[model samples]
Target: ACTKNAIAQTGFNKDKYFNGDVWYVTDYLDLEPDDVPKRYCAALAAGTASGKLKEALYHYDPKTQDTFYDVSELQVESLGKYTANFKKVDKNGNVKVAVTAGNYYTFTVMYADDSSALIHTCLHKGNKDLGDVYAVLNRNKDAAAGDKVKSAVSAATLEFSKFISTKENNCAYDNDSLKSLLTK
Candidate 1:
């Protein structure tokens, strides 16, 4: 059901984005609402390791206490656009599920600044293809979405009000694990 060919950020700075830091998901909009939980917490760490682009992901469900981690090797499609192959991993980067065909996602950076970013992703796993999911990110997990990121959401034709906020979920993250996982 994934359909959107999201536009990447103009004049995207790859070096800054992949600066080995964590970006917390402050808010998100899922086009296919029925397929995902109503409340969730997710964050990612993007950086270059051994000259290769990589990203580490963490997903949590506040209500269910369900959590997962993934580390992806990204291949650039264009500036701010990439195809990422993921492997489910533990906090210490021990593989729980090995990578396979069709276990990938398309990521596009719609907008980004030093402290905030807006991104779109479509995940493909086995026979399931999820629809577009847009996330508003910030460097601090508790930080509110700033004006620049909010404006970027508007530019993407998405209403900020429609996005679900992760702030109220009492979500906790293992920041050190996410950062170390980037090199794994």
Candidate 2:
């Protein structure tokens, strides 16, 4: 029998990630030094960090469920993925060439993971889109009503975006390029 892996990868290498100074690319976004990683990590954290996932936990044990409402974990939103190709879109896109599920992320949000990993998603071109699927997973991750889940996902987006941007820019290295982006 084969054994399953824990995280599917070891971890990220800061040096390798900054290879060719490409890490500076994020600085172009012009967020604070710390916000960058917060955004990146938020995007990479989980398909969903939304506290909304707690709805299922609540429904699981209705008696003690109310207690869960006060739990801080309930607030964290899942970081769902997004990928689009071909016509340049997926199921979620309401505009031209919208992206769909299992398509693959187009932009470079790379960090050095320990292994070959999935070898696809946002990093690779013409790869399958796991991002979209991740979003769908969030929708179903919680047992709350559709509206509630949607609300949570929406709320999480704003929160995570802030956290990611803040964390990324706060790093000392950000000082080098961050100044350039501001003036440019």
Candidate 3:
């Protein structure tokens, strides 16, 4: 309801980055409006707030009547060599780490509501952005720790591993490699 209202409220549309379709779809899984479990609906609604999920890239198809966007290809360029002090690797293989750059940025991983998919977000300068809109790499809803961690690493090198950081409120290093940062 909130996301629907925000979409209605902002009426924000732009080229390349945003469009109205964001409010209509959430993730790449293509789960239908009615098929989505009740518990997960609220989280998907949060997608309305953060325009990332709203970007023209993620959308629904009317002809086929389905949601689409391969999360495999849906990735952002990682920022440069970040010395992540991975303090813990949870049972699910989501690594929690703290960094010193960009004012102590921290990386967090969460399981998408009722699924094995993982949502990775970073808090730069110790600030928490809305935890609503998120993306994930492919995995079962109940993936194991080793499988989850290994898959992310594998995908970083083979597929969309690009990362980025902002400077003066713009993406300064848009093509940095995630492997370079994580493996270092």
Candidate 3 lDDT tens digits, 128-184: 332222234322322223455345434433222321111112111111121112112
Tens-digit per-residue lDDT, 20-131, candidate 1:
9999999999999876998899999999999989999999999998999999999999999999999999999999999999999999999999999999999999988578
Instruction: Score candidate 2 by TM-score against the native.
Output: 0.17
Highest lDDT, which number?
1
TM-score of decoy 3: 0.20
Candidate 2, after superposition: displacement of residue 89 in Å? Answer: 7.3
- Tell me the whole-model lDDT of each prediction, alpha carbons only: 0.94, 0.21, 0.24
Model 2, range 29-110, lDDT digits (tens) per residue? 2122331122321111111122221111110122232211001111211121122232221112223323334322232212
Better by TM-score, candidate 3 or 2? 3
Return the candidate ranking by lDDT, descending. Answer: 1, 3, 2
Q: How many clashing pairs does model 1 include? A: 0
Clashing residue pairs in candidate 1 are none
Model 2 spans > 4 angstroms off: 1-93, 99-122, 125-184
- Number of the candidate with higher lDDT, 1 or 3: 1
- The candidate with the higher TM-score, 1 or 2, is 1
